[PDB]
């Protein structure tokens, strides 16, 4: 890494000492350039994980996330640079500082070789995000939302810290390699039961799982757009990366204990998508949509079968690029109308023709048509879940049927209808918005040709 | 407001006749059954007791409601009709034209120049409409949904912009 | 009753305003002012060629548009597919497989050069 981490860190003094107005220019230049460099890690060898140093290593699961995060960094810059152009230079510089720092932690977290090093930076992502949602938020509930997001993540992470150091004292080193090659049978016992619960709850809260998820509708909606992406597009998957790594030692206790989590995710995903069927805030619509997709990842991890892990990463990457897109979409309207109510701005295809097209493919990707990467992920989990139990196809498909109704629902309510009479401030979409949307959907459809890169560490 | 009886019975006649259209189909059958429908309405026209009129209405509305055609004929350019809001998806509001690029603005100099005249005319007459409203507001707020006309000369009718400049029903 | 006298005047001024406003929605003969674009050489070659309009120009015009259509929509697409399906995929086994040519007793097989033994007599089951 050093070859990505150092350029990422070096963006921090660059943006601070950059020219007065060239901050957005230069930061966008090299963040795209750094993403190009991170494309180098998309290659993985036969079976051994790509190892660079003792503290840093990559595999066929971290690298597809690493490129996603570094590719995201330009996107938050352009999306947020609309409203941020109306404050002090230091304030705008402080934001770009914070996204650069937030991305820096994500790159170092995903390639962490020691589980303790993983946990330190995994929880360290809270500080850049927490200040983003609170300081630069555009509502009043953000103050309560930031507390909800911070406390939920921390309340689960702290048992992990106690559990993690326990492995250090008992088993020895916690390197992701030495853990794998020295896996021992975690026998069923009450102490092992809470050992299992502690090492799992921390990542479950950040998924989020059905019930430990009320921070998401508050955090995501109130957060600024530069944040509203990352809290949905990368760091939810950060909890995912934690699960797929920590479950190396939690066998065979996982199958005996997974039942409450499976039923909560498998049944709650129907309820969560049912919220999306009747919602009032467009941001909340996508937010609860993310919960349903992540809930499908939650069940996917726990069968611990080759197909499930592949469909886990496939949906995990695809949803992040998708859910990031919809937040850009809701941002554009929210700037023009200065409200988030769905029915307020009905009719956009009449006034904005291409915005409807971008909305069409955006709502289509969430609809997960074949061969879109969303479908290639959900379909894999359905087959893996069906092999686990034949009944689950009733629940698994029900969401697939239900997710069609709401995913096309904002398409009908916002785009396909009579334009609202009283609104008169809609402007022709800036070429920044359309260019940003292309930056989201073009890699997604391009990724369809070669799913092997994102298929996970079991291809 | 309060729909008086003579209006409501007329609504029954108009709607019931349109319903037997969906029933009678053939024109000669229509004209026969319409005349029986028409005269059977006129045979009871000397009811000095208004209560008896509603009592006559007490069976007519149920007579309509069970004799109504389950697939009544409605013209397409109307609610329920096949061509309801069919061409609405082209009704782009006229104020959107102010956002056109100058190259497209210069593409139609005559219409845009006249649009400026209308915009200038609307700007001048707006305040004229405004004081016209409070000059003749009913004591206690606007009583009726109706809208007073332009009383004096050189004054456009109050609240005229959206009605006059509404998009055509066939925009294409 | 009956248009009220105030509403009578109301609709009257609205009527003439609507007529005038829709009259303003008209289009003058000069409109739309369209700046030109660089013209491909084949177009100007056609215009001085179709000055008659007789079948002399009509048959060639229709067949040329059809001929170039066949080249750039039928010829060159099947050209690259043929290359794709003759050297690229064919170098990979079990990518293009067909049911064996259903042969019958009688006609010889082209490769073994042996007539397949025809069946024996059917019990004269004539109608």
């Amino acid at each position: 890494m050093l070859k990505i981490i150092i350029p990422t860190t070096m963006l921090l003094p660059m943006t601070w000492m950059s020219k007065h107005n060239m901050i957005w220019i230069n930061a966008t230049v090299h963040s795209l350039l750094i993403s190009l460099i991170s494309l180098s890690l998309l290659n993985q060898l036969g079976e051994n994980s790509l190892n660079f140093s003792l503290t840093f290593f990559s595999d066929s699961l971290s690298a597809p996330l690493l490129v996603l995060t570094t590719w995201l960094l330009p996107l938050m810059l352009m999306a947020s640079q609309s409203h941020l152009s109306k404050e002090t230079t230091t304030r705008k510089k402080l934001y770009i500082t914070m996204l650069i720092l937030l991305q820096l932690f994500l790159i170092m977290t995903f390639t962490a070789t020691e589980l303790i090093l993983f946990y330190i930076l995994f929880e360290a992502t809270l500080v850049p995000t927490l200040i983003i949602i609170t300081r630069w938020g555009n509502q009043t509930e953000r103050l309560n939302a930031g507390l909800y997001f911070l406390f939920y993540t921390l309340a689960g992470s702290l048992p992990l810290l106690v559990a993690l150091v326990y492995i250090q004292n008992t088993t020895g080193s916690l390197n992701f390699l030495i853990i794998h090659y020295w896996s021992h049978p975690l026998s069923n016992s009450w102490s092992n039961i809470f050992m299992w619960l502690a090492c799992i709850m921390a990542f479950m809260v950040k998924m989020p799982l059905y019930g430990l998820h009320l921070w998401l509708p508050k955090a995501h909606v109130e957060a600024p757009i530069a944040g509203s992406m990352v809290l949905a597009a990368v760091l939810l998957k950060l909890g995912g990366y934690g699960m797929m790594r920590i479950t190396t030692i939690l066998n065979p206790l996982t199958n005996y204990m997974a039942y409450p989590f499976l039923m909560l995710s498998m049944w709650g995903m129907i309820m969560t998508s049912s919220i999306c069927l009747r919602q009032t805030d467009l941001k909340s619509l996508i937010a609860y949509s993310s919960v349903s997709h992540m809930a499908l990842v939650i069940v996917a991890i726990m069968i611990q079968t080759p197909w499930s892990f592949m469909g886990a990463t496939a949906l995990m990457i695809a949803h992040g690029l998708t859910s990031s897109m919809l937040f850009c979409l809701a941002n554009t309207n929210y700037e023009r109308v200065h409200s988030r109510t769905m029915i307020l701005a009905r009719g956009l295809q009449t006034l904005l023709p291409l915005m409807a097209t971008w909305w069409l493919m955006a709502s289509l990707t969430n609809l997960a048509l074949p061969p879109s990467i969303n479908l290639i992920g959900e379909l894999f989990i359905i087959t893996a879940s069906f092999s686990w139990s034949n009944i689950t196809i009733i629940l698994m498909g029900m969401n697939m049927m239900i997710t069609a109704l709401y995913s096309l629902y904002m398409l009908i309510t916002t785009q396909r209808g009579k334009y609202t009479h009283h609104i008169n401030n809609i402007k022709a979409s800036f070429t920044r918005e359309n260019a940003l949307m292309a930056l989201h959907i073009l890699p997604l459809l391009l990724l369809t040709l070669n799913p092997k890169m994102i298929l996970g560490p079991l291809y | 407001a309060y729909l008086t009886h003579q209006q409501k019975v007329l609504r029954l006649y108009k709607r019931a006749l349109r319903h037997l259209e969906s029933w009678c189909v053939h024109r000669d059958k229509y004209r026969y059954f319409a005349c029986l429908m028409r005269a059977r309405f006129d045979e009871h026209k000397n009811e000095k007791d208004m209560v008896k009129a509603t009592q006559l209405l007490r069976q007519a509305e149920e007579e309509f409601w069970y004799g109504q055609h389950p697939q009544p004929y409605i013209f397409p350019e109307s609610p329920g009709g096949t061509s309801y809001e069919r061409y609405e998806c082209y009704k782009v509001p006229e104020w959107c034209l102010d956002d056109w690029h100058p190259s497209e603005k210069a593409m139609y100099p005559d219409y845009f120049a006249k649009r400026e005249q209308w915009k200038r005319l609307r700007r001048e007459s707006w305040e004229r409409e405004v004081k016209q409203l409070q000059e003749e507001t009913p004591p206690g707020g606007p009583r009726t949904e109706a809208l007073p006309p332009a009383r004096k000369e050189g004054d456009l009718p109050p609240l005229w912009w959206h009605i006059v400049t509404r998009p055509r029903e066939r925009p294409m | 009753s009956g248009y009220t006298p105030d509403e009578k005047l109301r609709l009257q001024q609205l009527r003439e305003l609507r007529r005038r406003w829709l009259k303003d929605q008209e289009l003058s003969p000069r409109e739309p002012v369209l700046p030109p674009r660089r013209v491909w050489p084949m177009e100007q070659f056609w215009n001085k060629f179709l000055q008659d309009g007789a079948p002399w120009k009509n048959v060639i015009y229709k067949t040329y548009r059809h001929s170039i259509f066949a080249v750039t929509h039928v010829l060159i697409p099947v050209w690259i597919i043929h290359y794709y399906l003759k050297y690229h995929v064919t170098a990979k086994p079990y990518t293009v497989v067909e049911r064996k040519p259903r042969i019958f007793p009688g006609d010889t097989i082209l490769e073994t050069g042996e007539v397949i033994p025809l069946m024996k007599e059917f019990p004269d089951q004539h109608h």
Partner: peptide
């Protein structure tokens, strides 16, 4: 009798 076609600006 051809007339104007009020449509959104698609130049951008």
């Amino acid at each position: 009798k051809r007339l104007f076609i009020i449509k959104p600006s698609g130049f951008y």
